Amino acid sequence: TQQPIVTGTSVISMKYDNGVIIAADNLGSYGSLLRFNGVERLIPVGDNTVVGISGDISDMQHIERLLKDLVTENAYDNPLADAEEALEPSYIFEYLATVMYQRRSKMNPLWNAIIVAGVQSNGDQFLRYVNLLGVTYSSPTLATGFGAHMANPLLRKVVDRESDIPKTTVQVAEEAIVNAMRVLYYRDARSSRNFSLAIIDKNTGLTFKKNLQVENMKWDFAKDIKGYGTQKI
């Protein structure tokens, strides 16, 4: 049994016609103090998988090392490590899902909420969630912590069910992700303006975008709001 110290907020994700998009901000919060601003919370494993981790940062860095060792271990005595026997998004998730549930059963959990986003070898989109309790689920849209309350409602307006996936393009999906990141910056007190965005497509491959910022913010209407009820000036 432990307690989270340095923490990362929401990890938001959705799947479109050709692949998946995942995003998380670059903040490392220390309670109410916004301590670290150069924290990458999206971890690319190979060229077909990106792992988005929220929660305890020290536990995240441990998972980082586990994923880098999984790449190293898979290449051992494997002449097809870059071809047929490469690490699939499903292999990466199931390993982490096993670890997360084993740790909670030993009463010493990794204080994290993880989304594994990628594309399988056959072209299928992979998007599954796993947390500190070992709870696993798949949905057209997935979000951790604060994003589950705010980003999910917005992203489900684009993809409400399975049939909406082939109807959604990269341009529409990314726009919905970027919009959700802006909304999270509005109402989440543990959020950063700077964020990373990763696109895993079955055609164009992995596209990792760094140092993105929340733009086109509405703040002008604040000048007209004065007092808290009866004050006029």
């Binding site: 090392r65 060792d69 190293t72 290449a75 051992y76 005595d77 002449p79």
Partner: protein, 140 residues
Amino acid sequence: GTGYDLSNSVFSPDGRNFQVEYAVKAVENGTTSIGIKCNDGVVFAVEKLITSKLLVPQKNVKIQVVDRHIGCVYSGLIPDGRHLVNRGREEAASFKKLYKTPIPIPAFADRLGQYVQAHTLYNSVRPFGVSTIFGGVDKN
């Protein structure tokens, strides 16, 4: 008298370990393998005896990778060579876990050296029937 060659850790009258020298005979019997150090790297090569046409070409890989920068090739008892690489991979992972940086080649060399030397200290263990050529690129 005689019998100094029947047990592993036993010194012979001339200060030799015959069981180790007999392990060398298993290496000399094995396939030939080489290593060439160049100006910025190393190159490993091995002979692969085609016993019959039934052997699937390019499949029975002999050269093994340790970590992501070290390559190992050996001659003699192949199973013994695999055991040494298995230990070397654990040894490399133990270094990276504590020191962050990937294991240096001279550092990795001693790690295999101490482990093989350990199998010459006891009569309950057998010496390795392999000579291993290995290397890679590190900090310097």
